[PDB]
Amino acid sequence: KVFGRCELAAAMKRHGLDNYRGYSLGNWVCAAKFESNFNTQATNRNTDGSTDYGILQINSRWWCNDGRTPGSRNLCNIPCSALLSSDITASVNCAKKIVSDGNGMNAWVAWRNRCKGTDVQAWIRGCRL
Ligand SMILES: [Au+]
Ligand SMILES: [Cl-]
Ligand SMILES: [Cl-]
Ligand SMILES: [Cl-]
Ligand code: NA
Known part of the structure; x- marks a missing residue:
């Protein structure tokens, strides 16, 4: 599923991401924008053989199991495929x-390089939240 900008903002809020660990909702929408262009099915292989999955490109190196990242951990205790669901509950819980x-x-490098310090509130501008 390719979420709309305000549609994702609404779902992230519902799942309690707004201001979680002090990060306003626009930071989370901005990270999703640059990590997956809002597509829940995005996958990208990393050079180390791990793979990033979902709207927030969660890495199999530490957080989910995909059966093909030797020596990695599964800290969110979930199959990486669960992070590609239309429903973002699993991605949010792991995030x-x-x-x-x-x-x-800063765990999200696109957030550090493309969102951090910017006017992230623009990402939720005009949304009915
Ligand atoms: Au959701
Ligand atoms: Cl922090
Ligand atoms: Cl593995
Ligand atoms: Cl959802
Ligand atoms: Na893993």
Whole structure:
């Protein structure tokens, strides 16, 4: 599913992401924009053999199991495929654990390079929330 900008913002809020670990909703919509262009089915292989999955490109190196990333962990205790669902509950639940890991949203490199410090509120502009 390719979410609309305000549609994803609404779903992220409902699942409690707005202001989770102090990050406003626009930060999360911006991270999703640059990580997956709002597509829940996005997958991208990393050079180390791991793979990033879903609207927030969660890496199999640490967070989910895909059966093909040797020596990795599955900290969100889920198959990576669950992160490609039309329903973003699993991605949100795992993102909450990632962002609590110590480095905040810097775990998402597109967030650091393309969202951090910008006017992230623009991402939820005009949305009925
Ligand atoms: Au949802
Ligand atoms: Cl594996
Ligand atoms: Cl949803
Ligand atoms: Cl932080
Ligand atoms: Na893994």
